[PDB]
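Quick entry between incubations.
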Amino acid sequence: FDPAEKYKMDHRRRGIALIFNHGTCADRDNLTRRFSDLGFEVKCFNDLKAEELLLKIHEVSTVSHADADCFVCVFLSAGEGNHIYAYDAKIEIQTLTGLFKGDKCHSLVGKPKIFIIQACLPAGADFLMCYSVATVNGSWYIQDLCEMLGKYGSSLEFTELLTLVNRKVSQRQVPCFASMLTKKLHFFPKS
Amino acid sequence: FDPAEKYKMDHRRRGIALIFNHERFFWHLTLPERRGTCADRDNLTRRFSDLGFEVKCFNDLKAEELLLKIHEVSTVSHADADCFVCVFLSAGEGNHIYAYDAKIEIQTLTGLFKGDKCHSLVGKPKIFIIQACRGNQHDVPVITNITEVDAASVYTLPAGADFLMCYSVAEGYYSHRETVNGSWYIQDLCEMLGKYGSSLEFTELLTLVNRKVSQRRVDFCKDPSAIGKKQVPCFASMLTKKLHFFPK
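Done. Structure below.
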């Protein structure tokens, strides 16, 4: 039994990263570059209607992630409480995250699923929920997240990096992350 | 700015570890006994004592009595303490735990320790470990250490700056309590505290607990109704630095 056990991140691909957008462009673009340098293929969506958001994300949930390390999904800036805003409706986050629970999504079983909600609980093994809260240059949270990904994304254990974000932001609003991760999570460079 | 910044733990004292342990309840609450909870209590007491805490246990307090002890504790000086730990072993659901006779909202308990209301813990880690869920009537499929299994019911919420909220189980999963040996969560937490508490960063350690617990399986021929009801623990961190419990 090894206390240093890490998620195996040696799949052909790092995986998909979804950005749903609802100043806020700076956030989106900054997240895009950061996740790309981390290997992620990034898909962005703008002001989707609920029928269309559900359609898309379900599409994504049902393709094979067999050859991927993990999955990232970002909602900025939707979400009061346990909901997120589409164009025409609020949607329970659990309804979206649920598509990725081991039951409903076999190829991500054992792999980390990361959800980042920025404000205007869901659960599953190997989930990591990041909440921004419990400007033309962006928002405090995303700016700092991207600054940390930039300098440390490739080396620090991910939840340590999120703690950094907690600290940078709380020195200016207290963000938080909830972990159901079962191992250390690193994004060392691939191939 | 330092990626490896740690909470300063060089205070005179480690701090207080509170344990609120609840085995039985008032009849009108309609809750079952929590057999095995005293094993949890005792195991935690040894582990946290090893790590330097003055541990104060309380058994089956009524809500008012409990509110009073928690309040008394939040109003003494903590200036020469590294941190604070509180544990609830009781029933609960949504946003509340149960004392002996009544529900108490969690946000009321943590609230007592938020920077406004509690100055001497500002910037210090406040750690809540919650092993709670609502016992129901179990259908027993057949015809002494029994494994009891219930659905997660307590919302796994965050609490404020420098709080770390640790939950035995997350939504959609199941809590397990062995009538003799105690909770899967508390057992595994104490085993990890035992082997690594004085070496490993606390959140790393809690990750280990997530793994040991979520790997546990009931044995079918001993507890047929309980598998496979997976248990997934969860922690919410609003910590701002690395947390260690090195010997003082």
